[PDB]
Design an enzyme around this catalytic site. Sequence first.
Site, PDB file in Angstrom:
ATOM      1  N   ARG A   1      -5.626   7.956   9.308  1.00  0.00           N
ATOM      2  CA  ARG A   1      -6.903   7.509   9.840  1.00  0.00           C
ATOM      3  C   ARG A   1      -7.727   8.751  10.153  1.00  0.00           C
ATOM      4  O   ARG A   1      -7.225   9.725  10.715  1.00  0.00           O
ATOM      5  CB  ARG A   1      -6.717   6.633  11.105  1.00  0.00           C
ATOM      6  CG  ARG A   1      -5.998   5.275  10.870  1.00  0.00           C
ATOM      7  CD  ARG A   1      -6.778   4.276   9.976  1.00  0.00           C
ATOM      8  NE  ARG A   1      -6.230   2.912   9.930  1.00  0.00           N
ATOM      9  CZ  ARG A   1      -5.331   2.449   9.067  1.00  0.00           C
ATOM     10  NH1 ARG A   1      -4.781   3.226   8.150  1.00  0.00           N
ATOM     11  NH2 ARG A   1      -4.967   1.174   9.135  1.00  0.00           N
TER      12      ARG A   1
ATOM     13  N   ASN B   1       0.805  -1.217   0.000  1.00  0.00           N
ATOM     14  CA  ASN B   1       0.000   0.000   0.000  1.00  0.00           C
ATOM     15  C   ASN B   1       0.840   1.269   0.000  1.00  0.00           C
ATOM     16  O   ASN B   1       0.322   2.343  -0.316  1.00  0.00           O
ATOM     17  CB  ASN B   1      -0.832   0.010   1.281  1.00  0.00           C
ATOM     18  CG  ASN B   1       0.029   0.045   2.525  1.00  0.00           C
ATOM     19  OD1 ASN B   1       1.017  -0.717   2.645  1.00  0.00           O
ATOM     20  ND2 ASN B   1      -0.291   0.955   3.470  1.00  0.00           N
TER      21      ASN B   1
ATOM     22  N   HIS C   1     -12.232   6.948   0.338  1.00  0.00           N
ATOM     23  CA  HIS C   1     -11.077   6.150   0.749  1.00  0.00           C
ATOM     24  C   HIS C   1     -10.714   5.185  -0.369  1.00  0.00           C
ATOM     25  O   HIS C   1     -11.291   4.091  -0.490  1.00  0.00           O
ATOM     26  CB  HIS C   1     -11.370   5.377   2.044  1.00  0.00           C
ATOM     27  CG  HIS C   1     -10.221   4.542   2.486  1.00  0.00           C
ATOM     28  ND1 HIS C   1     -10.393   3.316   3.114  1.00  0.00           N
ATOM     29  CD2 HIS C   1      -8.888   4.744   2.401  1.00  0.00           C
ATOM     30  CE1 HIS C   1      -9.203   2.810   3.379  1.00  0.00           C
ATOM     31  NE2 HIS C   1      -8.278   3.654   2.960  1.00  0.00           N
TER      32      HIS C   1
ATOM     33  N   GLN D   1     -16.536   5.884   8.498  1.00  0.00           N
ATOM     34  CA  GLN D   1     -16.155   5.454   7.153  1.00  0.00           C
ATOM     35  C   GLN D   1     -16.923   4.189   6.818  1.00  0.00           C
ATOM     36  O   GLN D   1     -16.838   3.217   7.577  1.00  0.00           O
ATOM     37  CB  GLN D   1     -14.648   5.195   7.109  1.00  0.00           C
ATOM     38  CG  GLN D   1     -14.066   5.191   5.674  1.00  0.00           C
ATOM     39  CD  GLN D   1     -12.578   5.353   5.669  1.00  0.00           C
ATOM     40  OE1 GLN D   1     -12.112   6.464   5.375  1.00  0.00           O
ATOM     41  NE2 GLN D   1     -11.825   4.321   5.985  1.00  0.00           N
TER      42      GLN D   1
END
Lengths: 353, 356
Positions: B258, B119, B311, B287
């Site tokens: 976050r 990632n 996201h 979220q």
Amino acid sequence: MKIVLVLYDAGKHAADEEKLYGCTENKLGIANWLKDQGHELITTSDKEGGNSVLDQHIPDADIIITTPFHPAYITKERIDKAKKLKLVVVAGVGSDHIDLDYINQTGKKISVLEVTGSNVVSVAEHVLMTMLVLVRNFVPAHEQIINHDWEVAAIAKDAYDIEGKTIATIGAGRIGYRVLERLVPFNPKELLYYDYQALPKDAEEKVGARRVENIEELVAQADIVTINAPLHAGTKGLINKELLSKFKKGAWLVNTARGAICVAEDVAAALESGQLRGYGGDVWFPQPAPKDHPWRDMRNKYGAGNAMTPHYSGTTLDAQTRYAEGTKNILESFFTGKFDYRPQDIILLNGEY
Amino acid sequence: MKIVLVLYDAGKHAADEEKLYGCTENKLGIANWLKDQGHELITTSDKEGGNSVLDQHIPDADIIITTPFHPAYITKERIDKAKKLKLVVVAGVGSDHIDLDYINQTGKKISVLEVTGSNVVSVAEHVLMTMLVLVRNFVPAHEQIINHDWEVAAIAKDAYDIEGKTIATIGAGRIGYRVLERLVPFNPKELLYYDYQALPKDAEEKVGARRVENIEELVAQADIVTINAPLHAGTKGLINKELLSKFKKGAWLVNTARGAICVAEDVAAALESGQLRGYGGDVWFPQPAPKDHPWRDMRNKYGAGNAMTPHYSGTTLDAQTRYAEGTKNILESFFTGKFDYRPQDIILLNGEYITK
């Protein structure tokens, strides 16, 4: 002496930001300095029409200061009528609006200078930003958010990393080379360039670049192409239907150089057909762009792939500070009679190339 | 063996792009491989409520595969019912949806793995992109074009270069460090970091970074701040009204870490008041973001300064290929009985932590 300064009227925006020097309200921040030096400054945005303020003052103007963001056309007729003209300055970079060939032909001792280097980082940043925006599919993603939606797959299906892509520049001069420098730590697969002269060896190796000998070969292997070359007979209309058909299918294309390097409808058709995944940049032809210009409404098959902006990359506040200071420096070199100009700022020195 | 794979449904988008591996329709590209090996794959997006497909199969699932982009909550209660569960995989990076504390504290013999490193580049690119978008005032500029306007001074009055700015990261782990690496050639005035441990001298020097001992003094001198730290007791609610009042006036702030590291309404108030010139990133709390989440409509005084996205930064197609391959590799290690996992992928090995 009489100095005529032609800039846009920023209106309410000039009161909002005192560092927006390049407008008629703020006068490059040099109005007091010019007055203290004993000179008369005429500032105007009115630059079209026979009775424009510019033309009212041309006959006895010693100095004219211009900007590519609101260009006063220094035409053949204006040069003929400017009987006291000694100096033309570009508060910025870009002299397309000045008939340099005619100035040279007349024999008149008119110097023409620009603030070379003052725009280059700003445009290079804009290029890399546009590449990331297109490759990572940012525009439709932000659009989802402000439209009160949320659908990750609709964005992700056309979103990539810049890492691992082959990136080519057409032109590796001041802007193009600074683009390559900024791309190095993104770990592209390869950085490529085409140009009419080689990068010096140490500069080439610093960015890991490989020179490609012709433009068709360059674009055929590139995932991302960026145009960073001057407009001349070799580049006018270069990005047309025929060349676009040689790009990799689904390539991304960025142009912050000059709009006329592209044929506008050919670019739009290539984005609609999928020959390009995305197009962006801040340069247009004609410019300012008409409301109907095809690059406003063009999209790829997913309704994205458009990262156009108006022509502003070189007029950030940091660039404007450089332009204003560089204009003051040129003017000081002239007023003092030292003519100790920076060599790179000279376009014509007393009429001569 | 029975494998339960929980991903989001991509609908028509999965038909549009076969490389969109991380959805229920395309099954990480591994469905035929699992069938040929004699395993039973249950694939579902239905992960909430006691009647869910997930909960129907929990009791005899040997393996559960999850994603942070549609996370199956592997809670105490589900773990207790998962009588055959041996392995939980994250097809991605991020384990907050798994009750690791409970697995470890009980001693249950359950391994938990993720595809570490897969990632990092994707999120770091998104950070630098978002910084440029905000600093250069891109969003209102593009809006002008698509609305058939042209008024350069309205954009230029709040547009800057990233060159010459002081940029600070809260956190200098894998993502934060790769953000700093990508910023070096933009010639910032200085790169700064705050973290609970120092970077080694060599890594600091490679990016020219200077460590600042506390967060208030870090943010007070930063033109741009980026959050690249995990959510824990030190960072929950960290970006609140009090800290924001110590930012440099007119700062730009990016958060791809976050959402709960920020107090959402405090960030919005700071953007509306001019304490921040811009905010962006792709992480939210809650979220997915509700339709009325304040980060959707917030703007600075000029109607801009908002570079929010859903996201997605770590679910680019290049990331998804790494996650699918990395999941296949973990599964192969498990099925062969080699357990030759990449050391960096282990979160728990048969319920235990392992030396990092």
